[PDB]
Amino acid sequence: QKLQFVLRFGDFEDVISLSKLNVNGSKTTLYSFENRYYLYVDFCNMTDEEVENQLSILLEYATESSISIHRLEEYGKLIISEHALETIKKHFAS
C-alpha cells in the first residue's frame, strides 16, 4: 500500500483545515492545479495501516486524486512545497 499519495483538496480553506492538526512526520507538498489545491502527501516511513490511518484524517478534509504525481512534477504549480501543511497553518489560518 502506497505511502505517498497525490490528493486533491478543493477550496484553499480545506488545505488549512487539514494543516491545523496534520503534518505527521510526513512531508506534504501543495500545488494549485486546476485552480483547486492538490497536496502530494508523503508519509515518510509509516506502515501501510499507519498511512491509511493518517490519510483517513487528511481525507476528512479532502479526497484522494487518481492523478499521478508526475503530471504535477512537470506542468504543475506550487503554493508551498514540501512543508505545505506546516506553512499553511501559520500563514493561512491565523
Partner: protein
C-alpha cells in the same frame, strides 16, 4: 429527494454523534459505518451484523483510522465523501424499493460509494465490500401492493392478452390508479352499448379535451363491478395501442400483418373487451385519406363482437364510420361525453396542488386555485378550463418563492458577501498573499457556516410558500400571457391606453372600460373581450388604440393583428360579365385572417375600414361576436372569446370629417358629435347589418385632433425621436414650441393621428439631419429644436 424514509435519516444522524463522540470535525465515512450498525436492525445495520461487524468491531477499527480527537467538531456537517454516499443511495433506492429512501440503500449505496475510512473498516474486519452490499440486498422482497404472487389461474386467455398492450385493470389491481374526476356520463352509456351482441361496440364522441383516458379509468372500474349484463361478465379488458405495433417496424405491411393476427387472437370473443384509441386512423373512411385502411379487417372485427370495442373518437371522426356500412354502421353508436365542469375543474387542481409538495410552493391557497380557473376562461381563453389553471397555479407556485431571492428576509445578502470573499481570498491564494489570503479565507469560511445555518433559515421560504399559490400571483401569470399584474391593467386601463393614445381620449376611456368589463368577467365566455366599430377620420387614435391595448394588457406593445377589410370589399368591386372573379371572402374565411389571429390567440384584431366591405364579411365577424369562435381552416374552432376585435370604419365619413373639434369651439364639438353619431352610425349600419351592430358591443366615434389631442401625440413621437438617438449617444429635444409646430399638420378634419409621423419626420429627422451634417449641432451635445419666429430654429445647448 422526493422526501425519504426514516431509516436513511436515522443511520445518518448516528454518524453525526460518532463525529463528536470520537472527535471529528466533519463527520467522516468512518462514522457513516458506525451509524449504520448502530441503527441495529436497519437493512444496512442488520446486514453488518451478518457480516460479523458489530458497532464495536467497526469502532475498534474506526478509532484507529481517525477517531481522536477533533471533539471541537469544526463545521459538523458531513464529509463530501459521506454526502456522495447519500446521493448514491437515493437513486439506488429509486432502484431498489424506496422512493422514500431508507437504510438498505444506505449500506448498499455505501458499498457502491465505497471509499476512504468506511471501506477500510470492512476490508480490515474480514468483510468484502460487496459481501456487505449483498447482505443488504438479500433482505429485500415485494413491496408493490397487490403483488407478491404465488397463485395461478386461467388458460385460453394466454395467446391473445400478451402482445400488446396496456391493461387499466392491472394497474388498478396494483392500485396506483387515481380515478380521477368525472367525466361521468360516458361511462353509463358504455355498458348498455357493450353487453350486447349483434353490434356490441360503444363509441365515445368529442371532448378530447378532458384527457380521454381518464374516462377510461371510469370504464375499467364499471366493467368489473358489478351492475353489468351477462356477456359483460367473464370479460377480460385489453387496451389497444397504436404505439406498440408501430415501434420496431418501418413498412406498413408489417403493421397490418401483426394487426390481422391480433384481430384473429381477439377470438376470445364474448369474453374480451377491446379499447381502440384514435379509431378513425385505422378505419380510413372518406375524405382524401382518413389514414391507414386497417378498416377492411377491423370493421368485421368490430361487427363480430370479437373485437367488441369502445371507440374513442372526436367531432368529425364519427362521419368516418357512419359513412361505411354495415360493419362500421353496425359498429359505431354514439354516446354523450362530459368533463368535470368549471367548478369541478378547480377541484381536480386542488387535489394535486397539495401533491406539488415535490415543489412545495402550493399546496394551497384554495382562493388562488379558484382564481386560476375562473380568470382563465376570459384570460387566454382557448383551452380547457382546468389545464389553463394549473399553469397559473404552478407558475405562481414558484413566483413568490422567486420573491425569496431578494427581499423578504433577504438573508441572501449573507451569501452575497460569502461569494465576494472567496474571490478576494482565491485570487490571494493564487498570488500569495499568504496571510493576505488567510484573512480573506477566514472572512469566507465565517460566511460559509453562517450561510449553511441561514440556508436552513431558508426553510422559512417553505413555511412562506407551500401554502399560498397567491390569488394575485396566479392572476399575474394569466396576465403574463394575457389580482397582481392584471388589476393594475384593469383599474388603470384608460390611463394606460391614454398614455399611448392621446388621439381621442374620449374613445380611450370607453375602450378601456369595455375590455375591462369582459376582462373582469361578466360577458358571455363565447364572445371576444371587445367587439367594436371605430368611426372617425381614420388613424385618429383608432389604429393607435389597438396598439395601446396590446401595450396595456400583455406588456408587449404589439400583440395586435391588422387586416384591411376594404381589400376584401366585394361591395363595389367583384367581377364583370366575362371578366374573371376574385376570391375575397374565401381568402379571409378560408385561411388568411383566421390563421394569423390564431398565432397570438389573444390579440387585438384590427379590421380596418369594414364599411367598405359587403354585409357578408360581417356574418363571419358575427361568429366571433356570437360564438367566441371562428370556424375555419381544417375544421378548427379558434376561440375568439380571447381576442379583442376592433373594426374601423367611416362611411358617414363627411360627418366624421366635420367631427368634434374644440379648436373650432366647444359647441362645434358636440354638434359635430351629435351629427356624426347619427348619420355616421346609420351609414355604418347601412354598410353593416343592424344584426351585426346587435352583437357588436360599442360603436366608438373618433374625432380628428380637436386642438388638444395632437401636440401630446406629437410630443410622444417627437420624444420617441429624441429617445431613439440618445441610446447611441445623441441628445436632441424638440421644445414644446417645436412639438407644437409639428402637431399642426394633422388638424385636418379628414386626417387622424396618422399624418403625425410625416411631421415628426419633416420637422425633427429632416430638419436636424441637414444641420448635423453641416455641424450646427452634433453628437451628445443638446440640440434644441425650438420655434422662435413661427418657424424652427435649432439652437444648441450643452
Amino acid at each position: 429527494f422526493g422526501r425519504f424514509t426514516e431509516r436513511a435519516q436515522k443511520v445518518l444522524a448516528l454518524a453525526q454523534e460518532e463525529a463528536l463522540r470520537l472527535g471529528h470535525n466533519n463527520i467522516g465515512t468512518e462514522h457513516i459505518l458506525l451509524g449504520l450498525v448502530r441503527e441495529g436492525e436497519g437493512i444496512a445495520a442488520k446486514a453488518l451484523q451478518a457480516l460479523g461487524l458489530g458497532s464495536e468491531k467497526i469502532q475498534k477499527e474506526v478509532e484507529s483510522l481517525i477517531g481522536r480527537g477533533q471533539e471541537m467538531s469544526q463545521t459538523i456537517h458531513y464529509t463530501p465523501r459521506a454526502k456522495k454516499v447519500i446521493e448514491l443511495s437515493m437513486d439506488e433506492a429509486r432502484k431498489l424499493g424506496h422512493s422514500y429512501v431508507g437504510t438498505e440503500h444506505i449500506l448498499l449505496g455505501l458499498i457502491r460509494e465505497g471509499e476512504g475510512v468506511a471501506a477500510r473498516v470492512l476490508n480490515n474486519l474480514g468483510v468484502s465490500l460487496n459481501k456487505a452490499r449483498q447482505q443488504v440486498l438479500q433482505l429485500l422482497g415485494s413491496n408493490e401492493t397487490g403483488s407478491s404472487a404465488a397463485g395461478t389461474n386461467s388458460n385460453a386467455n394466454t395467446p391473445t392478452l400478451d402482445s400488446l398492450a396496456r391493461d387499466l385493470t392491472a394497474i388498478a389491481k396494483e392500485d396506483s390508479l387515481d380515478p380521477v374526476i368525472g367525466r361521468s356520463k360516458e361511462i353509463q352509456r358504455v355498458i348498455e352499448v357493450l353487453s350486447r351482441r349483434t353490434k356490441n361496440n360503444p363509441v365515445l364522441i368529442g371532448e378530447p379535451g378532458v384527457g380521454k383516458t381518464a374516462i377510461a379509468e371510469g370504464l375499467a372500474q364499471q366493467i368489473i363491478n358489478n351492475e353489468v349484463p351477462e356477456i359483460l361478465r367473464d370479460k377480460r379488458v385489453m387496451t389497444l395501442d397504436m404505439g406498440t405495433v408501430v415501434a420496431g417496424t418501418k413498412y406498413r405491411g408489417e403493421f397490418e400483418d401483426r394487426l390481422k393476427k391480433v384481430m384473429d387472437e381477439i377470438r376470445q370473443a364474448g369474453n374480451i373487451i377491446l379499447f381502440i384509441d384514435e379509431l378513425h386512423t385505422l378505419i380510413g373512411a372518406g375524405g382524401a385519406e382518413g389514414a391507414i385502411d386497417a378498416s377492411n379487417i377491423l370493421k368485421p372485427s368490430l361487427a363480430r363482437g370479437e373485437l367488441q370495442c369502445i371507440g374513442a373518437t372526436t367531432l368529425d371522426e364519427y362521419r368516418k364510420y357512419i359513412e361505411k356500412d354495415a360493419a362500421l354502421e353496425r359498429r359505431f353508436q354514439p354516446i354523450q361525453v362530459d368533463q368535470p365542469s368549471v367548478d369541478e375543474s378547480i377541484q381536480i387542481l386542488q387535489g394535486l396542488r397539495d401533491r406539488y409538495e415535490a415543489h412545495h410552493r402550493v399546496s394551497i391557497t384554495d382562493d388562488a386555485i379558484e382564481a386560476a380557473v375562473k380568470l382563465s376562461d376570459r384570460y387566454i381563453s382557448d383551452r380547457f378550463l382546468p389545464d389553463k389553471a394549473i399553469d397559473l397555479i404552478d407558475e405562481a407556485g414558484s413566483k413568490v418563492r422567486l420573491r425569496s431571492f431578494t427581499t423578504p428576509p433577504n438573508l441572501k445578502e449573507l451569501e452575497q458577501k460569502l461569494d465576494e470573499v472567496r474571490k478576494e481570498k482565491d485570487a490571494a491564494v493564487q498570488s500569495q498573499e499568504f496571510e493576505k489570503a488567510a484573512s480573506l479565507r477566514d472572512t469566507e469560511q465565517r460566511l460559509r457556516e453562517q450561510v449553511e445555518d441561514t440556508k436552513k433559515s431558508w426553510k422559512e421560504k417553505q413555511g412562506q410558500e407551500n401554502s399560498e399559490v397567491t390569488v394575485d400571483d396566479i392572476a399575474m401569470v394569466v396576465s403574463s400571457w394575457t389580482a397582481q399584474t392584471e388589476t393594475d391593467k384593469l383599474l388603470n386601463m384608460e390611463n394606460i391606453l391614454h398614455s399611448r393614445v392621446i388621439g381621442q381620449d374620449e374613445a380611450v376611456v370607453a375602450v378601456a372600460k369595455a375590455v375591462r368589463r369582459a376582462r373582469a368577467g361578466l360577458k358571455d365566455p363565447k364572445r371576444p373581450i371587445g367587439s367594436f366599430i371605430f368611426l372617425g377620420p381614420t388613424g385618429v387614435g383608432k389604429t393607435e388604440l389597438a396598439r395601446a391595448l396590446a401595450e396595456s394588457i400583455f406588456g408587449d406593445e404589439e400583440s395586435m393583428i391588422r387586416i384591411d377589410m376594404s381589400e376584401y370589399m366585394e361591395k363595389h368591386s367583384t367581377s364583370r360579365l366575362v371578366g374573371s372573379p376574385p376570391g375575397y371572402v374565401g381568402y379571409d374565411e378560408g385561411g388568411q385572417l383566421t390563421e394569423k389571429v390564431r398565432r397570438k390567440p389573444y390579440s387585438v384584431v384590427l379590421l380596418d375600414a369594414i364599411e367598405k366591405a359587403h354585409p357578408d364579411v360581417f356574418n363571419i365577424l358575427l361568429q366571433v361576436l356570437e360564438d367566441g369562435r371562428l370556424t375555419d381552416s381544417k375544421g378548427r374552432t379558434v376561440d375568439f372569446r380571447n381576442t379583442i376585435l376592433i373594426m374601423t370604419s367611416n362611411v358617414g365619413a363627411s360627418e366624421l370629417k366635420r367631427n368634434k373639434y374644440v379648436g373650432f369651439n366647444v359647441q362645434d364639438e358636440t354638434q359635430n358629435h351629435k351629427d356624426m353619431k347619427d348619420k355616421v352610425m346609420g351609414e355604418l349600419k347601412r354598410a353593416f347589418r343592424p344584426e351585426f351592430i346587435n352583437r357588436i358591443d360599442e360603436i366608438i366615434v373618433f374625432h380628428s385632433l380637436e386642438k388638444k389631442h395632437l401636440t401630446e401625440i406629437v410630443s410622444l413621437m417627437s420624444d420617441q425621436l429624441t429617445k431613439r438617438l440618445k441610446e447611441q449617444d445623441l441628445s436632441i429635444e424638440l421644445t414644446d414650441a417645436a412639438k407644437a409646430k409639428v402637431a399642426e399638420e394633422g388638424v385636418d378634419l379628414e386626417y387622424g393621428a396618422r399624418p403625425l409621423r410625416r411631421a415628426i419626420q419633416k420637422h425633427v429627422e429632416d430638419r436636424l439631419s441637414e444641420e448635423l451634417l453641416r455641424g450646427n449641432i452634433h453628437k451628445g451635445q443638446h440640440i434644441v429644436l425650438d420655434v422662435e419666429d413661427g418657424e424652427f430654429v435649432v439652437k444648441t445647448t450643452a
